[PDB]
Design a protein around this ligand. Structure first.
Ligand SMILES: Oc1nc2ccccc2cc1CNC[C@H](O)c1ccc(F)cc1F
Lengths: 40, 148
């Protein structure tokens, strides 16, 4: 399986970017396999 | 080797992820490559450091990205969607509260092939990578940053 990379752009902030998404506060746990899960 | 954001492809071709080239080191999420060597033109990038729990991997050298979310300001996801040009999405992160401290998190739900896309602060520094998270139907991604 040929896995390869291609450049897609500069690392830059864009002034006129679309803005969206909320800002949830969540209690989570991180297990040994790197999986996050919700905690109550 | 040029600094920038890159697609991670496999072979028809499919985009499995995204990564960041900085200071000669390629940075992506472990689950994107599972540590496999990467082709870059005629050259080969070999894995250098990786950690399944952090879900991170670096190629050609140690992890170089060390900026962190300031906990107050909006950030930008520099997404590279499969089949589309790189584009920026601005958002205010939420928070993952863990027993080991808080982690910034972005409530943005984009195609799996965007995993590894960088999240930036206002100065253009990479504060982490997108694509390891939880579901609350909506996906929320940790802002995953390594250690330099
Ligand atoms: O608006 C649309 N319009 C559509 C119209 C027809 C069919 C499909 C359609 C999908 C969309 C949504 N496209 C999102 C974009 O691909 C993207 C932008 C930022 C990012 F971070 C990651 C992304 F994948």
């Amino acid at each position: 399986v040929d896995m390869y990379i291609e450049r897609a752009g500069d690392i830059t902030w864009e002034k006129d970017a679309e803005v969206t998404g909320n800002s949830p506060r969540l209690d989570v746990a991180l297990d040994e396999s790197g999986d996050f899960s919700l905690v109550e | 080797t040029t600094d920038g954001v890159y697609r991670v492809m496999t072979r028809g071709s499919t985009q499995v992820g995204v990564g960041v080239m900085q200071e000669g080191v390629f940075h992506t999420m472990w689950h994107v490559t599972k540590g496999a060597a990467l082709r870059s033109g005629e050259g080969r990038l070999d894995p250098y450091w990786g950690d399944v729990k952090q879900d991170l991997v670096s190629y050609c050298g140690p992890w170089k990205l060390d900026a962190a979310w300031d906990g107050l300001s909006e950030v930008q996801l520099l997404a590279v969607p499969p089949g589309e040009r790189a584009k920026n999405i601005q958002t205010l992160p939420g928070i993952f509260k863990t027993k080991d401290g808080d982690i910034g998190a972005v409530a943005l739900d984009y195609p799996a092939g965007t995993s590894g896309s960088p999240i930036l602060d206002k100065s253009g520094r990479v504060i982490g990578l997108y694509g390891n998270g939880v579901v609350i139907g909506s996906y929320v991604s940790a802002i995953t940053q390594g250690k330099r």
